[model samples]
Target chain A: SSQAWQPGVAMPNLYKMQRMLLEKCDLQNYGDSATLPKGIMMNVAKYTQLCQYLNTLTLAVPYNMRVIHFGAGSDKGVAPGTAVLRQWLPTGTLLVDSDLNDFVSDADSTLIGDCATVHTANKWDLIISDMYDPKENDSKEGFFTYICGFIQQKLALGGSVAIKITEHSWNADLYKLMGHFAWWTAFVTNVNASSSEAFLIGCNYLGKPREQIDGYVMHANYIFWRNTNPIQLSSYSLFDMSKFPLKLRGTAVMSLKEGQINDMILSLLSKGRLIIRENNRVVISSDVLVNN
Target chain B: AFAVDAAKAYKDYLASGGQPITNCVKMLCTHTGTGQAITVTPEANMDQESFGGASCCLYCRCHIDHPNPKGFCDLKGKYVQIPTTCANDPVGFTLKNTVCTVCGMWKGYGCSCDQLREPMLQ
Candidate 1:
């Protein structure tokens, strides 16, 4: 069951907290290579944006959080930022990767198998995934669905999950699915030649908790409507009849007045002699001279 | 135009000593003889309302027997009025995102159809 947002609770001052703790040395870089292991980029601007958004929900690097990284292909495992996160937290981060050879050698804990099939007893505050396959078939059955299921079953209450995927997979239905369990959600799209990626973050805090996460995602946007509540048309009035121009038009038949009706009937009857047409007994006035 | 023709036909029928048109003013389907026709009566110099009660208009499409078909008119009908709640869905909100995708006439409003083939008198 879901809960509504309570307004009176004194929330954490995330803005002040993050600025106080976030430091440049806390960020790691994987050399001149623009692409780091597991979809993290060398681009600091985009990374800063992602960090700032998560910081609002108190999920920043220094939070001593238990974390899991999925699709952590063999190389260095998790993003360098994630590596920095592991340094600050006491618990060893578990890295799950499909390929036996793909497991990160440096990963403190490694699980070698398909993430969807792998099971573990430990629950975590943060689960990071870089395994969203955009080419996977069926939106309802694909990567996003599996991720939601994992979050529901394994994520600790108040925990958050972040995923990296392509912009092509974003849609309203997917957003709605994420909204079901999240109090706040945000995503950013980073376009780079190596691996253009989009990152999505969702928190499991109940009720509408105001704008906790804030950032500009390059490719797509989302809404924060309650899954159980109906869409308020007042807010969506801009999306009226005119918005769907390509959709099928109304088939409702318009009425005719007495005088207009008379002209149409008279015109049809005047076309020729009053006789029912072949097959269907359509009464039409014919122009041909009748033998009768 | 069917109304106009019916008015003239009824006038001619009366002038020829014809009384009681007896639900004979029917607007038949263009292709189906058995298809239902709209039946209405006329008085001297029939106007819009004289043919089909006071509510009939040149742009109204009446549903003889359809799913709560009244209020389906697109012109005068309040198709834009938001539904207070989803009648069929228990968990649905007051207004559904589904409504945004469908036609206004289908928005639990009155019924209407394209105008008859004959030009309507303004």
Candidate 2:
């Protein structure tokens, strides 16, 4: 018999996304919440690193940057000392959560402070978003367009942004789009619900033209680049690329053509308007430091 | 390129007094289709070689490109094996490099092949 996806009983409403996500698919290895804050994801390494980085960033950075979080999960600003800056910093960090647009007050009330603006806007300085419209189901292009709009206007000229993306974002289309002004780097987070890959990255603007960085190739997390200063930060956790398992193996059957499979992957890859991976292989990441 | 020992069969058939055709020319012509074009060099060893199963039977099935102005059937460049099923069907018969559903040659699994056989046989 299969285990029931009872997030209410299995995990607290704080971070039991896997239990709720399990109700959507047959996921395995999401056993217990040994890693405290991250209760559902299978690979705790990436999630842990993401949490650690967030913790470090909250204390490291001098001033708070405006953030735009798309699919605001339950754990974004909850933990006792998660977003410590919200209490210290006056303003500048705005977490615009797209998913919780209607009932914003219900999810993360801590974002309801004077410094953190819960309202939606067209622009931001350092937009920290993971905004994928789960409803559209194939909304990566839309998400890119939205990101592009913000990158052009909302995003502060010398500021940065962070986005949690899926594997499909690392393809020719999105790569070509962002490759123009942004010097990008990608890494798959090891803390995935199943064998699926999740990504965390830091990117920055480059003086080079789009033609030079045109043929941008997507990688399987763990690969990093020192863009602006060229100082490499050797930081790869469970979300590291080396631990990614083969989620899609070639079956022995010949029921469908490879093109059809590729098409299906494209559609299911994104929600609302975010292309997780270019062709649905690795997670796409912004070219900005998420921690600090 | 492969060697075949037909001497035993030829000799056994020959002992029956020309019951089986084992001459070098005849044997070569039957398999190679060389007919009277191949010369028969007679020698004492002919009998020994002929009777030892030296006769070979060969036939070549070659695939030629479409010679017609309009070209040939659509069987040329078309199918790719997309792995949706567990069975490796349609063995070695495709042109396209992408995997696809419902290919040529191999019939659908669990489905009856009876429908295809009757019409083609007639």
Candidate 3:
């Protein structure tokens, strides 16, 4: 449901993939936090390298806007968008910062906690998350899952969210997350092709919430083709096993409860990512390993 | 390192009266004639056809690598591939994350004891 990316990622098939808007420009196009004009600030592009990679977005901040910033630790931080975005925010803008670690500056307000259990009951015109921990090697699924649910909970309707996602966690599962918003785009500022991070900016929330974490079965058994920006597809390859242009290193499924149901699916995906279901909707593995 | 002593393991296993709730390999429980291997229909050994793309990074949880050197478990701890049937789930009967957090070598029981049926006892 997203705009076709210039060098876009693919589904079960990678050959028929479209182009994604990922261009090869850097600070050249949008100067660093210093020279960003009002036009760019009114929109998605901003002052720091974070905004430099933000492309193809149109946003309007209210005269009395509300915004929240996550991952406010200075070490993982960029120059706060607040300073450059100051003119756009009036006296009642209500800007806030949150982090597990402390900020060196008290100039802005703060929330102290890890992202998973942190608390905020307010909606925002804009939500900026920079939770990409440099100390961690890869951004795991736990936080990605948390961010999706958080946006669903806290993002004001027609509001927008910009998040820092590691290149490792940039799967199609997250791309599919864009459709929840009216429109979206993501880009990487890292010069190296193998760089570790990318950022996502999306506007106009569609009110489509993510499946709940920690309760009930949410994610289904699905495909994650190797060496590609993966999309979360249901167990069967949407009617294409032979036609799939990508190699499946494997498939994965999640357990919601430690019960009869989890036992069965765990039993199947324990062998193959794809498992068949019957009257009981129970999982039965075709990839059985006998003592033989 | 998680291995258990099989010779004396089933003695504790036979007298145990609860469902299997320990991290263990089936062999440790069956070394004394408790587990019977039943072959079912061959599982659908599905994999993507090897083609144009290069190998995925170790950090990428979505893609299982060619020959999947990373081994038997998926990122969320679900077992995706292993040569042994019970090796995929060391805890055997239940997939509870906490339950997994052991038998025989430490407590005198293994998964084989939990897997036993009333028929096996008679």
Candidate 4:
């Protein structure tokens, strides 16, 4: 009824993960791979931006950050975005990955049933959906409506969502649903997938509970993660306020100072954790970027 | 002050335990007493704007908290909106704000103080 995920047909596993991610180390050099690496993750280079974004989310508390990936169908036992998370996320980070489609890969901590109907942990750090695919033409609203509803209940204070929605189904609902959240909302077409679908970013949907706790509020810890290296002032401390991680309601970037923060952002430019762009500014990167 | 009240509600929420609204309704009122039964008034339905904040389901200890908002009786095992006391009034029918409480959003999506502020009934 619907098209299958990438590669369409199986090819020789020449370089192991060479099928989709087998491209040259183009677009700012994230890796050391040279000539013709066959197939490849269809220019996973576009995903580099989110990786930089991920690096920004270094939490104050360890093992508290949670991410839920819906429709995490895998290839050769590996889901698409799971690789980005496994690479960027700190170890012990809890990731709730689920999909109806079965792709065998023990690396996945996947739940096999429907996501919207099942029990879910609220206040997630991030929710990415590359799992939904269009079928039955565009009728009866859209299945992504459930995804938005999931985002409504789950996306924590100052969290974000980058979801794939079919172009045929993008209607008045986009304008309507945009108001539910408190921050930036945008629609952009992925060149590769533009013919059928596009991405909509729901960023910083911040609504903090008026409820008070001790000196430490969970909302502050939830906004975005930062490497709490003391000497890395200004850059290290977002907006000079430890409570609110981002500059303005979670959108403004932190002012970079000297000390340890420098080595992570500029020094390793496209070297280790490859840097990417958003909001007309460059983001930090990591060299550990891998596909397989 | 708002934060303090919300935090206070949170404390109660933790104490009450995060169970479904149905269970919450069960704990809010009990059937051991004669007048403990409560029936949802047609007027019980409310929205956010119409919601008046927080209020108690019943005042007197004798009042029974209706276990089923859907109008089912756990004791009688029959259907009759609410039990009209064992004989007559427990205290006065006047609704009060304290002594025992649930969120103002209680009638429709009405709930305890904790769940009230949790997701705000979406």
Candidate 5:
């Protein structure tokens, strides 16, 4: 049988979350000391890095930016360190969770509903998601697509979406959406620990140049090294013209038309430096003619 | 272009005395059509090479008789072998043939199938 997702039991660092919640000044007490703190999530270090990366990209919280968090467990002021999103962005911060009882204290800022169906009138400058767990038999890919769709709908122009994902959670088909709609696939991973964790950041800023995006991603890589941290980082512009088909296809899938496949095969002979194979048979070969 | 050429190739195969091959094209969505009904007719005289070129969407079959067909993870995108019975319903097929439950596709140990999982196929 497969191992159960024992976040509390499997991860020993989770104990820190209970202490972190107890130390928080704003949240209400659950009364029961034995109960698991609502603030604790998959990994404390990963969660801390999530907030830190967001601050690094968005010029830190208190800048008057609106943010929405899906599967927002615990209370608003709950965080590993002094960095609390709600306290900084007090003007427009929305928290969503299906179970109201999950939070220490419920208020207007916290919406009691599912992230897939949640809607709000005001678009957000940043959307942070930390709701998924491996324990559930949910479709991880579908969940990601749904979150991306929500990000496209609710995110303001040039806004960003930050999410936490597990290993093998991402695949080639997932990156195809980045072509036209979004940009920047910046991510960091700390896999040296007992349980590896990944954090992803995406944005919808179309005006940003591809070079800038590549440079930005390269900078994240530098930071990952500079900090002497185990979390590897990569950031790149998804829509850069120079990084077209080939670069994008490295992490994306191509849905070619039937005719295109046929044309690709037929053009091999006339094609200057291209090769096409059909059913392991050499249908067209530029090398054959050049050698002859 | 893929359809036209593949159909022509299939026809050529038949003309050359090549036997027609049959295979199951699992549907990701429900099709109200009957099982015997050819939802997607292969291009005229489609050859094996061209037939393989047609995407899975070009061919889909309804499981009217089975009602509940067994589902297995097509990890390599190839569905050659018939899948085992659903874990939830040992005596019968799964609730939905399209749902990819936790099974032994990737491992040699065993499967962990649960019928109570989500109904969404993909």
Candidate 6:
């Protein structure tokens, strides 16, 4: 399970109730994306703003910790993100860039950590890997293996990792069982009002004590325990209209504007980040989306 | 752009006997439809919640055979979402990474088409 996020995203309810906001926003063509349904009702302009708000989160957390980036550079072209992050932290932060080759310069440190290449190293405090072999015809499996190896051996204790992935046809259980991880949503946006800037921040995995690994799903971003950080409650709010929070065991409920309901349950309950079963759903909380 | 035409092309491909394949930012396929070699391309809408996280530069593509359908799809219905705990999967995957790559009976004739088979499609 994940750490319950207050103000986190409510999946179904948000989508269902979007009409209210859409009408208010006067959104006409909700358009389409391979990631979403055909008749979406959400406001595109608002969506882009929301995503930008999500991206700003990386600035609020800890940095200068050893970081490793997988499937980065070259074809990925996400260097701008790294470029933005690099300046915020202390230099000599020990960046172990991972890819097929050991490409590095005085400007960038090199490390070997490719899913297909099978190279391992000491775990990192933070790993930024969007590991995926799009060509292998096993995107799910490829991603699963990429995360499994990174989580078990690479990610450091109390550390977190962030990834960029497209939600597609893959078994959810596989992601749930992949390793000690948690998920969080990230937003993106581009050009038009209903179309312009839009995206998501997902799978924010916060590393926890080895004892807390039994049934906890992984969040993508790294978790840090500070002197001021409070020990959060267990059990999340599930967005099940059929049932309410009958027995609150260190758990809480969150309701999004779109009638989206989510349960913030215990650490032992969250299994995966996104795909919910008929009766299976928990919450993923982090500093990014769930500030509460 | 990716929604209506891309899905229409995909449905048509499935009808013609093509399986779905998964991509980084989207799922796609290619198939020839009713006297027309229909190509469906579903690009990942960077702004949609489906892509997850804010990105100045987002990426997802379906560049296979000619005149392939290329546009966006919504993550609302019959699509993917972030789960508190992963227990199930999204709807489907693009098969063979190309529309012409699959073998099937279209118009009562068996035909084979190949695609670019990009690095991600390997």
Q: Estimate each model's TM-score.
A: 0.34, 0.33, 0.37, 0.37, 0.34, 0.33
Clashing pairs in 5: A189-A231, A217-A235, B9-B47, B10-B45, B10-B46, B10-B47, B11-B45, B11-B46
Q: Compute the DockQ of candidate 1.
A: 0.01
Candidate 2's C-alpha runs over 4 A off are A1-48, A51-64, A73-94, A105-123, A133-139, A169-173, A177-182, A193-195, A200-202, A206-211, A214-292, B1-122
Writing each residue's lDDT as its tens digit, candidate 5 over A71-161 gives 5544432221111233223322343323222332111244544454455555455566665544122224545676766555555444556
- Per residue, candidate 2 scores C-alpha lDDT tens digits across A1-292 of 1211111011111221111111122224333222322112221233334433333221112122344445443342212111211222223333333343321111122232221223333333344444543221222455555655555544332233445554334223444434533334333222233322333333332212333323222321111111111111212232222212212111111123324435333222211111111121111122322594
DockQ scores of all models, one per candidate:
0.01, 0.00, 0.01, 0.01, 0.01, 0.01
Candidate 6 segments exceeding 4 Å error: A1-64, A76-78, A101-107, A116-120, A135-139, A169-174, A177-183, A186-292, B1-122
Error of 1 at B78 (Å): 68
Chain A TM-score vs. truth, each candidate: 0.45, 0.42, 0.49, 0.48, 0.45, 0.42
- Tens digits of per-residue lDDT for model 4 on A1-292? 0211111111122211111211111122122232211212422322323343333432222233456667665442334345334334444445666666553211125566555454553456566666554432222234466675666665543455656554334433433443333332222212132222334454444333222222111111111111111111011111111121111112222323324334344322212122111222111111232598
Local accuracy of candidate 6 as per-residue lDDT tens digits, A1-292:
2323221221221221122211111223224332222222222222222323343333112223455556544342223223223322244455445555332211144444444454443444445554444322122556556565556555433344445433232223233433433433332222122321212233323333222322112121111111112222211221111121111122112222212323442132233222111211211111222465
Chain B TM-score for each model?
A: 0.17, 0.16, 0.15, 0.16, 0.20, 0.23
Model 3 Cα lDDT, one tens digit per residue, A46-109? 2233332332343434434556777654442222333322212333445665666643212135
Tell me the alpha-carbon RMSD of every candidate: 31.9, 28.6, 26.7, 24.5, 25.1, 23.0
Q: Rank the models by lDDT, top first.
A: 3, 4, 1, 5, 6, 2
lDDT of 4 at A31: 23
Error of 4 at A13 (Å): 43
**DockQ of model 2, rounded to 2 decimals:** 0.00
Model 2 compared with the native: what TM-score?
Answer: 0.33
